[PDB]
């Protein structure tokens with residue numbers, strides 16, 4: 001093949017090379033144009049899933065994909081950290097939160113997921129992988145009236161996230177510091193696995209041990225050209241589970257959301 | 265995993281296996297219920313494309329899948345053979361043609377493809393893999409006003425197809441007896457590759473030799489749960505080509521249509 005996007009990706013990657021192994025040192029505002037370049041390709045609806053796979057699975061694309069993935073995960077984390085601190089210090093925390101670069105995408109993503117998971121008010125949700133800015137947990141309660149535990153493995157990040165939640169005056173959202181294994185001691189209707197919850201294999205194998213066959217489990221992943229952003233959940237990762245529904249993203253939303261149940 | 269379709273598919277395949285033991289010759293009337301059972305699975309809109317490969321390509325579905333695909337291709341051949349002779353014998357050949365089980369699907373599919381391929385009246389089209397009932401060729405002239413060559417590898421099938429065309433009074437449809445390699449000797453604006461043209465690898469390699477980079481090429485394939493019916497065209501099959509458009513089927517239509525151009 002001979003896709004125009006091949007060269008475009010290689011060119012973007014060449015301008016990321018000199019940041020390799022040091023993407024966490026990036027200036028957030030300064031690198032936004034790079035994210036736009038990457039997302040122009042990711043979000044191009046004329047790229048079919050077969051063509052995307054052709055490009056992204058090619059051995060010659062491996063280093064470029066690695067550069068772009070490192071950039072993406074580092075920019076995302078830094079954007080969250082920065083916004084979390086801004087929200088905590090703000091006189092108008094909800095207005096500050098609504099200005100988050102990704103805020104409108106999260107509203108759409110969650111709308112997708114609430115249909116997929118048939119969320120009902122008063123249901124109990126657990127979200128694995130909260131991060132500094134636990135927006136999903138927040139929305140699950142604020143919009144969907146669910147009762148929520150957010151799980152975050154890094155104690156300092158967990159503490160920051162609590163301050164965001166409390167700053168906003170949001171009720172019914174608690175953060176538990178721990179790994180995915182903390183769900184053993186919880187009772188819940190819906191389990192959600194962050195796009196960035198890692199490592200996938202260990203996480204899903206642990207989840208399998210705790211849930212029953214009725215637990216609605218939604219996990220976030222990347223499909224099509226959006227897989228340029230981050231490594232997709234693999235088939236091996238979800239062994240012992242059956243897929244029951246998917247929402248493929250549109251517009252600027254990055255994640256595909258997948259509903260699974262523990263076998264049988 | 266633990267898909268309920270697995271058992272349903274295995275039971276269907278058991279029935280196919282038992283039937284094949286007793287008869288080599290298909291009983292077209294008798295097997296329509298089996299076809300419909302298979303198509304009800306194929307057409308299940310609740311199963312997404314990635315879930316479809318998860319359930320269909322699982323290693324312990326190989327035997328069942330191979331039986332179902334053999335059934336589908338053999339039934340289709342026999343239905344075409346039977347309808348072709350019926351058309352030839354009929355005092356009302358168009359009315360007879362329109363009773364072909366799959367007829368409405370062909371109209372919808374061709375509409376999809378005429379948009380995808382920007383078909384214009386008087387353009388020359390080649391269709392590889394005509395069959396006893398060369399409906400696509402017939403429609404390309406009858407509806408789309410194209411000048412058509414239909415290619416059929418089996419001389420007795422090619423001969424039968426010529427009689428169908430003549431019975432219907434359809435002009436501008438010629439049948440070439442030969443394999444895909446006949447295209448070197450033909451002028452054409454658009455090339456179409458039957459879903460059932462085989463073998464895919466050889467067919468595309470030979471096409472690649474004999475087309476230029478401006479030639480519109482549309483091939484037919486099976487995606488999602490419709491892959492239960494027949495082996496799809498792989499990305500490796502189309503090495504040397506780039507995808508430039510895809511139409512995914514709805515309703516009862518089985519084929520996905522893909523536009524490609526030779527590189528580079």
Ligand SMILES: N[C@@H](CCN[C@@H](CCN[C@@H](CCC(=O)O)C(=O)O)C(=O)O)C(=O)O
Pocket residue numbers: 076080102105106109129130131132133134135136137193194195196197220252253254255256
């Ligand atoms: N703090 C976050 C977790 C981190 N991000 C999310 C994913 C959010 N994805 C969004 C926002 C943009 C992006 O992730 O690139 C989308 O798909 O458009 C996750 O990992 O699940 C949350 O609360 O959901």
Ligand SMILES: N[C@@H](CCN[C@@H](CCN[C@@H](CCC(=O)O)C(=O)O)C(=O)O)C(=O)O
Pocket residue numbers: 344366369370373393394395396397398399400401457458459460461484516517518519520
């Ligand atoms: N004689 C045929 C060729 C054999 N069938 C076609 C495909 C026609 N497909 C239709 C009819 C149903 C089916 O093929 O299962 C559809 O997708 O709904 C081909 O192989 O390309 C023709 O003239 O197109």
Ligand SMILES: CSC[C@H]1O[C@@H](n2cnc3c(N)ncnc32)[C@H](O)[C@@H]1O
Pocket residue numbers: 077080128129130131132151152153154157178179180194196197198199203
């Ligand atoms: C930045 S958003 C993603 C968050 O998920 C957290 N995380 C990743 N994997 C796990 C896990 N297995 N359990 C709990 N939290 C996790 C990370 O520490 C990060 O803060």
Ligand SMILES: CSC[C@H]1O[C@@H](n2cnc3c(N)ncnc32)[C@H](O)[C@@H]1O
Pocket residue numbers: 340341344392393394395396415416417418421442443444458460461462463467
């Ligand atoms: C029944 S519809 C499909 C038809 O395609 C024909 N066919 C399959 N592969 C090829 C090919 N490579 N070239 C020409 N005709 C083909 C088969 O003989 C069948 O009649």
Ligand SMILES: [Br-]
Pocket residue numbers: 297298
């Ligand atoms: Br039966």
Ligand SMILES: [Br-]
Pocket residue numbers: 355356357358359360
């Ligand atoms: Br008639």
